[PDB]
Amino acid sequence: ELREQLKELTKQYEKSENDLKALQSVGQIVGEVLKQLTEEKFIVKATNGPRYVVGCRRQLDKSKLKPGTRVALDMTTLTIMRYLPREVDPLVYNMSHEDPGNVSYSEIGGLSEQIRELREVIELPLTNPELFQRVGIIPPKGCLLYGPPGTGKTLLARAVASQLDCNFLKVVSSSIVDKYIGESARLIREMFNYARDHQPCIIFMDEIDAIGGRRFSEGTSADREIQRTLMELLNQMDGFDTLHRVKMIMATNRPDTLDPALLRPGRLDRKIHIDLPNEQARLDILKIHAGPITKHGEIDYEAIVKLSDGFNGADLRNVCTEAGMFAIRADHDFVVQEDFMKAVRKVADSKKLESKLDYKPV
């Protein structure tokens, strides 16, 4: 038994020795080089804000650390120890890594023209970028999926994110806003820096009107800070530095409140309207959302669609859910057309509490 006993003890020995070696190491202050002075003096600013002139430990290949490069200054002498790659904020990391479920284009109904416009803007320019060169244009960069609530804008964005390969950055415009000074604009700058670093990229901003609202001439300090964020965003899209292979998608249901500079054709090139489902769109959505429901009758989807006038995709999904609710309440392990009719009338009654939904840009 001593063999295995001492083997495990030696494994724990290696672990503990590694732990002690780590324990005998101290951290280093990350800054960015500003300029090189005399081959041994570098003006470096620590991220905390102070600026110093510091030395450089020898094996650093001074050519590798140029103005703007992240470096690790020693915590005591502040001398450079190693150059680092550009930082990726934890926010931008999780933005890139959010899971858009596994939504497929087969889960979206009436949106066919809109789907192909979005794909025209996103996919083809990033896969065959020479057709547009031949025709003599620079393919559109920005999309505005605007429409009434629950018409499928976020579902379409999720489908695109799941079904395309290029890098994708998920973000709700209200989850960029921070109370610190300049933090939101800095976060947007880091978004676009990450996008440029990973050149084939898409940036989806859900409910953009959180940030991209109209600019107030009499707003508060908070409004002015959010407007600074908006203007940083506008400069990033169509400012001095051109954007290559980075596309923007922005979803909204109050496009009338967006800044005209944001709605400008140069920034949000193609504004596509995810309108309320028409007759055929309602039929398609109802089939999509009633496919998995165990129906045991003859379903006049046409009648359901006729009574579903003015509904949205979420309303039709709720029609299916309410038919199921009626089934359980009746203690039935299936659904029928009487249940579907009751559900659609219930949702129609619920729709009476809404307000204006036909909001358009410009």
Binding site: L131, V135, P139
Partner: protein, 69 residues
């Protein structure tokens, strides 16, 4: 000038319209015409493409009630 148009475009008809549209709007119109040409798999932009692009981009037409004038 950077694109390759068919000789049937006659941009004058589009220029001589009563729309308040910026240079960005003009670039968007031309860009959408090129996009439609690519969609139909052609490398020459047609008057059809420009018509469709203009109608798709300059959609400001709304209101202007006729009884005020």
């Amino acid at each position: 000038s950077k694109m390759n148009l068919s000789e049937e475009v006659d941009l004058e008809d589009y220029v001589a319209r009563p729309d308040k549209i910026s240079g960005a709007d003009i670039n968007s119109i031309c860009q959408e015409s090129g996009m439609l040409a690519v969609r139909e798999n052609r490398y020459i932009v047609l008057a059809k493409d420009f018509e469709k692009a203009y109608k798709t981009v300059i959609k400001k037409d709304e209101q202007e009630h006729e009884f005020y004038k």
